[PDB]
Write a protein that binds this ligand. Structure first.
Ligand code: 3YN
Ligand code: SAH
Ligand code: ZN
Length: 418
């Protein structure tokens, strides 16, 4: 079973409002072999709450990280969107903060090592930390040194002893996956020198709310983060937020830079600005989260009826992509193999398997091209630009996409915009 949350991860208070509850839901990255029955498929409570002190949004429960990550199926995206963005991460970290060549970059949640490879090509030393043993072994084989463990205070000490003081510690879409964020901040403080930086990239709570990105809620994502809550945490561990860049990736994200409170790095005015913008946008008020809750109910209702109405007219519908978030979407909406006949996915591992809960088949893009699909529900919507750019033939044949946010809509639109 999953361990229930008591006190807030960031600020340590215990006062939260309920925002939305999806009940028991299977794990989003637990894909299954095709079978006759799925009676013993595990399901865990999926519900979110909002801490009134610092306004961290969090799940009510914490699924065991040993269960989630020790055999992880998701390798870092090989898309042009992520290749480009990884290059941009290097550029921002190096040029904005003046990190010299030959400097040491440690990455938490380094996965296959693609992001570290980009730092190596820019002239840096690297080391990765990732508990996914299968994925860690690939990174190591490829020449990118990765410790096959979770980040911790003692792993941080091992790194300092064996590899030294890093100029940069990086965590991309891992910080919201960790329960004991307090221990992460502590290991970071010990690791950082006076001008070292800790950088985390996470989905931005502001974008999540304004765009109704409820499908990004799943068990791996324990936290849903705004800048305010991060300041509340780092305050308590001798750390200080010095810079933030807003990013279009993964539905709107923030790349946050953190240094030692008594260190070289001055605080940029942008930090105060975003904290003021979060207040200004109603993040510290109960109404905003009840508004989010009904938006979700409306979108869920509208998405299901849109799909079932089209099917009733004799239209064929499939899913485009089989991302983790897609599985939250389809389970909450209650869609099945009768509504979507398959989900196409470029991930070889996922091909020939079946989605969690809904049990919809995952097929290859080359199979998908043989089938006369009328509509694709765009589950991998965070790659919307790249996907639409290469689906000209489908679109020219009268094919259409259904996008789930900010509001459900049909691509192509009825008119050109401009
Ligand atoms: C761009 C593209 C993706 N895909 C597939 C590959 C992937 O399985 C899926 C996209 O998954 P995506 O990268 O959005 O990630 P998700 O599977 O949604 O989530 C993973 C793990 C999660 O913990 C996290 O933090 C985020 C950042 O990453 O869609 C295609 O089939 N065709 C495409 O053209
Ligand atoms: N406590 C922890 N310490 C280090 N890595 C962790 C962790 N918990 C989860 N992870 C790893 O973090 C990754 C989350 S997915 C993000 C992968 C990569 N940074 C990318 O953006 O593509 C997984 O590889 C998972 O194994
Ligand atoms: Zn809090």
């Amino acid at each position: 079973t999953a361990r229930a949350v008591t006190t807030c991860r960031m600020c340590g208070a215990q006062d939260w409002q309920e925002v939305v509850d999806f009940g028991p839901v299977p794990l989003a990255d637990s894909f299954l072999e095709p079978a006759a029955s799925y009676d013993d498929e595990p399901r865990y409570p999926l519900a979110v709450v909002s801490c009134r002190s610092c306004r961290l949004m969090s799940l009510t429960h914490v699924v065991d990280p040993e269960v989630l990550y020790r055999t992880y199926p998701y390798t870092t995206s090989d898309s042009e969107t992520i290749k480009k963005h990884m290059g941009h991460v290097v550029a921002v970290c190096v040029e904005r903060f003046g990190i010299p060549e030959g400097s040491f970059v440690l990455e938490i949640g380094s996965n296959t090592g693609s992001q570290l490879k980009a730092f190596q090509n820019a002239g840096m030393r690297t080391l990765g930390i990732d508990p996914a043993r299968n994925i860690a072994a690939v990174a190591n084989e490829r020449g990118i040194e990765t410790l096959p463990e979770f980040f911790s205070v003692d792993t941080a000490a091992l790194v300092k002893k064996t590899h030294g003081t890093p100029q940069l510690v990086l965590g991309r879409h891992v910080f919201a996956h960790i329960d004991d964020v307090s221990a992460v901040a502590e290991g970071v403080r010990d690791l950082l020198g006076p001008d070292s930086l800790f950088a985390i990239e996470v989905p931005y709570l502001v974008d999540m709310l304004e765009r109704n990105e409820f499908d990004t809620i799943y068990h791996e994502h324990l936290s849903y983060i705004g800048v305010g809550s991060l300041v509340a945490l780092f305050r308590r561990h001798g750390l200080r937020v010095v810079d933030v860049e807003r990013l279009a990736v993964h539905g709107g994200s923030i790349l946050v830079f953190v240094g030692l409170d008594e260190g070289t790095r001055a605080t940029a005015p942008v930090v105060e600005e975003l904290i003021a913008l979060e207040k200004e946008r109603g993040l510290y008020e109960d109404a905003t989260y009840e508004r989010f809750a009904r938006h979700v109910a409306e979108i869920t209702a509208e998405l299901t009826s849109m799909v079932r109405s089209l099917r009733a007219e004799g239209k064929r519908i499939a899913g485009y992509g089989a991302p983790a978030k897609g599985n939250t979407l389809l389970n909450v909406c209650g869609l099945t193999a009768d509504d979507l006949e398959f989900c196409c996915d470029t991930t070889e591992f996922k091909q020939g398997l079946v989605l969690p809960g809904t049990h919809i088949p995952v097929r290859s893009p080359e199979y998908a091209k043989t089938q006369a699909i009328d509509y694709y529900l765009l589950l991998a919507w965070n790659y919307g630009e790249e996907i639409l750019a290469k689906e000209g033939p489908f679109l020219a044949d009268g094919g259409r996409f259904i996008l789930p946010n900010p509001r459900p809509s049909i691509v192509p639109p009825g008119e050109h915009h401009h």
